[PDB]
Amino acid sequence: KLQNKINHLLKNRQELENFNKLPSNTISSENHLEEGSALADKLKEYIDK
């Protein structure tokens, strides 16, 4: 589900990339990428366990 969220946010970024006019929304998508990366590291720790 987190990887599908990455797909949704990158689709939103592809919607809002050209003729940029950047909203106040994409930094939450970047924080969500960091959260998914952190959860990926935690599940990597768990599969090592």
Side-chain angles (χ1 to χ4, degrees):
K1 204 218 164 178
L2 266 283
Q3 199 261 0
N4 192 276
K5 182 255 291 169
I6 300 196
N7 296 134
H8 158 252
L9 70 90
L10 72 92
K11 267 179 179 173
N12 296 135
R13 288 167 79 181
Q14 188 59 44
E15 285 140 35
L16 314 170
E17 48 95 19
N18 39 5
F19 201 61
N20 172 50
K21 307 304 209 296
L22 181 79
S24 64
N25 185 36
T26 323
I27 206 165
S28 169
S29 70
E30 301 281 349
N31 204 353
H32 274 51
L33 295 177
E34 302 310 308
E35 182 256 0
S37 77
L39 278 180
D41 308 320
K42 301 312 118 178
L43 67 93
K44 187 56 69 191
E45 295 151 15
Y46 207 83
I47 190 175
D48 307 333
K49 296 159 210 148

